[PDB]
Amino acid sequence: TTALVCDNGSGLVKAGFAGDDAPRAVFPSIVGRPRGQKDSYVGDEAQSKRGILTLKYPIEHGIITNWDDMEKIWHHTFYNELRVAPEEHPTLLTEAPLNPKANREKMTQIMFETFNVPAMYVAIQAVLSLYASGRTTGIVLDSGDGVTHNVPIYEGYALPHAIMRLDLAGRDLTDYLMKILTERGYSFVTTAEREIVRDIKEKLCYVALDFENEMATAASSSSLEKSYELPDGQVITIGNERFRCPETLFQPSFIGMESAGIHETTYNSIMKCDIDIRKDLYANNVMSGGTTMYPGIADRMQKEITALAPSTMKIKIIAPPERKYSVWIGGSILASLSTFQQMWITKQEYDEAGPSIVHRK
Amino acid sequence: TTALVCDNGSGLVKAGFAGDDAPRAVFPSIVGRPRGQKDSYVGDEAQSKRGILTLKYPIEHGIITNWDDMEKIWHHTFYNELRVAPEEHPTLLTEAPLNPKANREKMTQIMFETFNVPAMYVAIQAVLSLYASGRTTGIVLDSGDGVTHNVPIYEGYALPHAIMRLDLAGRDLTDYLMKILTERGYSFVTTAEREIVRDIKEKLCYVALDFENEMATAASSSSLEKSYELPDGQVITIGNERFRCPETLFQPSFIGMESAGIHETTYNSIMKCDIDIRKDLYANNVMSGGTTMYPGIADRMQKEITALAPSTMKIKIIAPPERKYSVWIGGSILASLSTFQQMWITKQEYDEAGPSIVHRK
Amino acid sequence: TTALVCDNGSGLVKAGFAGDDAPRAVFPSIVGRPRGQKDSYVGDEAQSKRGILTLKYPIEHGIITNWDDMEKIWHHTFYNELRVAPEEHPTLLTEAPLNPKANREKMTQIMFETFNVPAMYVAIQAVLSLYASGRTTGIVLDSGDGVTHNVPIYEGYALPHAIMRLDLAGRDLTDYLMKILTERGYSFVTTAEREIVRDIKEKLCYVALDFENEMATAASSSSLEKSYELPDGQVITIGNERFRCPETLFQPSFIGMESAGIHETTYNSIMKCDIDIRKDLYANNVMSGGTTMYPGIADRMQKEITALAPSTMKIKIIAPPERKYSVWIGGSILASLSTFQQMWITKQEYDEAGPSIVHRK
Amino acid sequence: VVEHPEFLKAGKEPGLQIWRVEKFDLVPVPTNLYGDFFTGDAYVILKTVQLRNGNLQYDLHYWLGNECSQDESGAAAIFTVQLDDYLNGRAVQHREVQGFESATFLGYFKSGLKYKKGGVASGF
Amino acid sequence: VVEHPEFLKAGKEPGLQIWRVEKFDLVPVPTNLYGDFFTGDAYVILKTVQLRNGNLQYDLHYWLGNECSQDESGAAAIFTVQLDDYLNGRAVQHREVQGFESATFLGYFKSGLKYKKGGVASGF
Amino acid sequence: VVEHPEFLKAGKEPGLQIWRVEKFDLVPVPTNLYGDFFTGDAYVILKTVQLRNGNLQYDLHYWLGNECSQDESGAAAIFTVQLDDYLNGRAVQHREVQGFESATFLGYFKSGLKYKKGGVASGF
Ligand SMILES: Nc1ncnc2c1ncn2[C@@H]1O[C@H](COP(=O)(O)OP(=O)(O)OP(=O)(O)O)[C@@H](O)[C@H]1O
Ligand SMILES: Nc1ncnc2c1ncn2[C@@H]1O[C@H](COP(=O)(O)OP(=O)(O)OP(=O)(O)O)[C@@H](O)[C@H]1O
Ligand SMILES: Nc1ncnc2c1ncn2[C@@H]1O[C@H](COP(=O)(O)OP(=O)(O)OP(=O)(O)O)[C@@H](O)[C@H]1O
Ligand SMILES: [Ca+2]
Ligand SMILES: [Ca+2]
Ligand SMILES: [Ca+2]
Ligand SMILES: [Ca+2]
Ligand SMILES: [Ca+2]
Ligand SMILES: [Ca+2]
Ligand SMILES: [Ca+2]
Ligand SMILES: [Ca+2]
Ligand SMILES: [Ca+2]
Ligand SMILES: [Ca+2]
Ligand SMILES: [Ca+2]
Ligand SMILES: [Ca+2]
Q1: What is the distance in A from the centroid of ligand 2 to the CA of B170?
Q2: Fewest CB within 10 A of the end CB: N or C in chain B?
Q3: Region annotation Actin-actin interfilament contact point: residue ranges (chains D, E, F)?
Q4: Which protein residue has the closest C-alpha to ligand 1 atom 16?
Q5: Do B161 and C244 lie within an 8 Å CB cutoff?
Q6: Which domain holds residue D75?
């Protein structure tokens, strides 16, 4: 048989087979139920049936909040997307930093008792990303669609007490971009159009190295102007919006948040760690997740941490090319190692010890 | 004449006069000897002469371990602190739960033969605290600087077979806080600075109602952050450390102990008692000692016992305002009662029956 | 023919053939009579018919109290257990220390006149045990189900004037354990459950070397905890109960007795003997009977006698591995010796001299 | 505590005996006043019942008013223990709090309880 | 990860132990080849030192060639952690990159390092 | 126990008499073998001394080898008592254990003791 790798995020599900260099299936982690049709839907069909369904996101800020919808998602992942028999494959699942013990236990229980998998495993997302970048020590900046985390890792393991979290990620960036574009007299807030804003964000947005100077530049010339062909026809163009949208990550107050920006939470995370490993961490900032894809993001982080760290500190920001899938790749690698055969948690061990064996020492 | 009340603890001595509502003298139960000065010192001077003395704690986990230093302490208590002539006052002393018969006898012998007191008495600390809270039945959680005890008491008397003990108290909490602060690049481990850590602990630390959620909260915002002005100048601030330090009482493994936490030892103590008095005990958990002063401690205990007891059980946690001195107050009240005149053990009875009369029936 | 060996105790009957290394039959010395069935029962059937019978113990504290039930027991021993014809075998019976002359005579009369044995003999239990341990001089601590005795023996014979007795043995230990377990909310006091308590006692109980320190240890950790699988299902666990139960032998007041403990009665027995044989006795304390089977018992006795004897005295406690059957084994050996043929008391001698010949010179 | 005169005459007959804690001492309450409790004080109540065979049983209640000082509630609790010991421990102890007394306790007072403000000063 | 045979014989004696990542597995390098590294591969290096009292200390290095595939650099990093855990976590971990290795690492190879082109194919 | 023939001839003259326990019986040892003891057996030794006035005194020793079976050590102890009784109780009894015999006992054998492995089978 061949193990399965499933990375569940606030916005997208990444699933596939261990040994593969990338996820075979990537769909929205959305469940649709009748709000006359009587079926409930998952992912892209759920979105296509917006008008007759009520959509919900099973995962909120990286944490599973609705287990019945989460079950549908996993069911749709096995039988529809991957087309496999769960009972047939050991499955490695991923979990967000600081996931409550109860969630880990309930995930385990459902896999074994509902899907009857022969074996399973639960890994922290940030750790899988660090591994993907060929590193055992560093601080990961993981930013996806629903949450952003700072995770300092040392010799293979996360330091829980130092983890920072920020409820600000892609979806917040899309809403903001959608807001500033609506103000200028447009409208989406629908489906193919809300789809359009996200697409404008992922294709035209970037992070400014120096926000004031970019603003001054955008105000003085059309050099930063960009155009986007709408699916209807008209061509909308944007200038300072391009970098104003992502700037929110560094200045949460742009959308009403009192929290510190990602450069500040990265610094605070490092300052919360043992003085003797901080150099390891400053020299190994690894970016992970779709919201770290913005052009300019790494240079900006490098500059802001530099302004906060000791003048002699070697500061390095690492931005892997496929960091949209780092977490999945890291899991694919892990579940593939010859040494991993004895790391799975088997049905036997479960049926004999209970969901509690999903924790470690 | 007026009786004297002396409560000897692992870290502090509480002494004064029966009839008083609080202890006149409170100093460290420390003895310093020359490690060039040739005098030996007690309490706060002993600490001031750290550099020329070797400090020892006569009481270890509530039990007297070094009688020659204990004699110095009592000498310093009478002549220096209280300024009285021992031979002049009947003295009530306190003893820890499960104190060996030999210790009780040796305490008696020293008081009579070395200090020549006219009369004395030995009371169990936990029992004096329960009395202080206006109760004859209940289970006391006494936690000071060196030891923590669970003492179930019924109609005035302790149930020895049900007593639980945990070698984890304040000093352990200060060392831990000192450890996590040193890791972040600070240093004390000295005197005025070790003094500083204890002070940070007693002013900023508190017990979390739900540890994971507090951790999540501290990781997501600065709402739990607190600052402390060091005596030099810089301002150190702490967040999750505030509740991580006291959490050790519920999870001993935070410092390397394999023992159960205080909620569990309280429960086991109750389950060791006669089924017919357990309701008395669940409804009367009385906290006592300085380490029970943490804000949040009572609510947390209430919640954890509730999760362990029968669903219909009335669970109540009592936290007296001056529980740092409950033991002394209870002794002050006891030695003052008109009925107590005939309860003392007089020199006559001693000189005639020996240290053995210090035990009961 | 082959002689029969019958050791009658307060709780168990040990019977078999001289020459054998162990008793062929071991059953409860209980007689059941109708309290509708009209038969009376002995031993294990008697217990199985609890509900329709009234159970009585023919032997009280080692002494036969009811001769009609004692006759039933012996009848059941010959015909049911051993399946032999009494008239066919010489029989050696055992008697407790300080047995009244009248009992010895009545035992003799019944054997000859009721069972028609061809020859018989009566031996003191403690003496048979000493012989079993390869010794002619020493002080035996015999403790069974109903009584405990200190028997100093010199060059083959007991010293009656020095014998000590304590009406505290196994049954008292089982009742006590049963009492403390009931207090914690359990119930037996029935049959298979009263059977359960005895079994917990014989498998989990042990004697503490130092009672206070063990108590302190049991109060400070779960290191002395033990679990027992009840026949229904639930698993009950015990800690200090394990050594609290046997401690009663050293402190009779745990169950309300004003008597001295076994270490004290052993010492008093020795001090009652001629100063010139005391060294023989201190160096030869031999344990005998089922209640001496507790792990830790020998070390504790060794320590307590040491605290009472002269500092230069060589103190040794001997604990034979099959001391549950020492008395029977010693009788088996005795009745087997080639020199024993002329020691029996024959029917002739009886029919000619009367029950009185059962005494010695 | 045999030699206090109050202990001498405690539990000698069926009925109620009510004492009030006064500066570390137990002072008997005038029988005609059984039922009135100063909310700023603490009291010890002994209920003695005679069985058909003439034997007596005891129930000890210590009542604490919402405004009593620690010394009084402390003494009341200590006195209850001592009185129980003096009665060879045969008494059953009951803590009674103002506004929440047990049915049994409330049953000792036909015309109900009267909580009056004030009381004796603390012995501290 | 106890039951891999490579882990069984890791850190049992003073000296160098060099393994190369090969299709998700750790394959030992021939002792006579210690020092040659394919730039297209990833390796795990364990340095064991014996102290004067016979106790052993460990230093783990995972070397990444500039042309190794992600699966190999990933595995090398995971193997280092596992090997460290197997050694009760006593090993100190070091990431070594081609052309920029630490002085300590370079010090393990008297006759310097030999970076040769090529290596084993990716396990993807 | 008068009628055993061994008892008849016991203590009739100054010297040593050595018997070995054999399946619940006392069997005399060949005088030329006095001193050799099978460690798996038990023996009874009678030392008879003649005083200047012709009277005899007795000292009884029962020797137990570290490998004898309970039946033998038991019989040896019972035989010693019986032999002492037959001698009107005038004998002084001594328990002797292999490797720890008393000086007196060791003194009966000029050319020391010889402990040889084995012996007679248990009578059980
Ligand atoms: N090229 C890009 N530029 C900017 N944003 C992008 C790009 N590609 C994807 N994204 C965004 O990053 C977000 C997604 O990431 P990921 O797939 O990392 O999220 P999750 O795992 O679904 O969410 P979370 O990690 O927050 O629980 C999406 O919301 C998407 O809009
Ligand atoms: N407000 C407070 N918050 C937290 N801890 C406090 C507070 N006040 C005092 N303490 C701590 O409680 C401990 C002291 O108690 P106490 O005076 O109760 O101890 P002891 O009697 O000296 O010790 P033990 O009872 O363990 O033998 C001290 O170590 C001190 O640090
Ligand atoms: N392993 C054991 N541990 C503790 N007690 C045991 C053990 N085995 C047997 N016993 C107990 O010892 C007692 C029995 O002994 P024995 O057979 O010695 O008694 P008796 O001869 O029946 O009584 P007695 O000698 O008092 O007249 C029983 O009550 C039994 O519970
Ligand atoms: Ca994610
Ligand atoms: Ca710099
Ligand atoms: Ca204390
Ligand atoms: Ca409840
Ligand atoms: Ca017996
Ligand atoms: Ca000695
Ligand atoms: Ca008052
Ligand atoms: Ca009582
Ligand atoms: Ca390669
Ligand atoms: Ca390590
Ligand atoms: Ca033999
Ligand atoms: Ca003799």
Answers
A1: 6
A2: C
A3: 71-74
A4: A144
A5: yes
A6: 1-124
Query: Ligand 1 within 6 A of A202 CB?
Result: yes
SS3 for B177? helix
Same domain, C65 and C186: no
* C-alpha atoms less than 13 angstroms from C-alpha of D44 in its C-beta half-sphere: 33
Q: What are phi and psi of B110, to 5 degrees?
A: -65, -40
Beta bridge partner(s), residue C235? C229
The alpha carbon of residue B217 is apart from the nearest alpha carbon of chain C, in Å, by: 34
* Residues whose CB is less than 8 angstroms from the CB of residue B298 and which lie 6 or more positions away in sequence, other chains included: B287, B317, B318, B319
What secondary structure, in 3-state letters, does A73-126 show? HHHHHHHHHHCCCHHHCCEEEEECCCCCHHHHHHHHHHHHHCCCCCEEEEEEHH
Rounded to whole angstroms, how far apart are CA atoms F1 and F24? Answer: 14
Query: Do C113 and C16 belong to one domain?
Result: yes
Cβ <8 Å between B165 and C215: no
- Sole residue written with tokens 């694919």: A332
**Cα(B208)–Cα(B214) distance, integer angstroms:** 6
- Nearest ligand 2 atom to the CA of B8 is 21
Residues of E in contact with A137 (CB under 8 A): 93, 95
Ligand 1 neighbour A11 (Cβ under 6 A): yes
Measured distance CA(C221)–CA(C214) in Å, rounded: 11
Both C107 and C147 in one domain: the answer is: no
Chain length of chain D: 124
Q: Chain C within 8 Å of B275 (Cβ-Cβ)?
A: yes
Contact between chains at A19 and E7 (C-beta distance less than 8 A)? no
Q: Looking at CA atoms only, how far is residue B137 from chain D in angstroms?
A: 9
Q: Compute, in angstroms, the gap from residue C90 CA to the centroid of ligand 3.
A: 27
Chains that touch D (3 or more CB pairs under 8 A): B
Question: Is residue A271 a contact partner of residue A234, using CB atoms and an 8 Å limit?
Answer: no
Q: Do A16 and A112 sit in the same domain of this protein?
A: yes
Question: How many domains, chain E?
Answer: 1
Measured between its terminal Cα atoms, the distance across chain A in Å is 29
CATH code, domain carrying C141: 3.30.420.40
Q: Return the CATH number at F52.
A: 3.40.20.10
Same domain, C89 and C198: no
- Pick out the residues of the known binding site of E: 40-41, 72, 84, 89, 91, 110-117, 120
Domain boundary among B236, B255, B274: B255
Q: Measured between CB atoms, does B361 come within 8 Å of chain A?
A: no
- Whether residues B221 and A100 touch (CB distance < 8 A) is answered with no
Residues A250 and A297 in one domain: no
Ligand 3 atom 9 nearest Cα: C290
Q: Are A275 and B185 in contact (CB < 8 Å)?
A: yes
CB C248 within 8 A of CB C172: yes
Q: CB under 8 Å to A202, separation ≥6 — which residues? A: A293
Are residue C160 and residue C276 in the same domain, yes or no? yes
Q: Which value, to the nearest 10 degrees, does the dihedral of the CA atoms of residues E7, E13, E19, E24 take?
A: 10
Closest in B20, B134, B337 to D24, CB measured: B337
d(CA A296, CA A247): 11
| Domains contained in chain A, number | 4
**Atom of ligand 1 at shortest range from CA of A198:** 31
Q: Give the CATH number, domain containing residue A38.
A: 2.30.36.70
- Please name which of A72, A79, A68 lies closest in space to residue A106, comparing C-alpha atoms: A68
Residue D47 is assigned to a ligand binding site: no
Q: Return d(Cα D74, Cα B19) in angstroms, integer.
A: 12
Q: Which residues of D78-115 are buried (b: 16+ CB within 10 A; e: fewer)?
A: bbbbbbbbbbeeebebbbbeeeebeeebeebbeeeeee
Give the helix, strand, coil percentages of chain D, each rounded to 5.
25, 35, 45
Q: Which domain holds residue B7?
A: 2-30+59-122+325-359
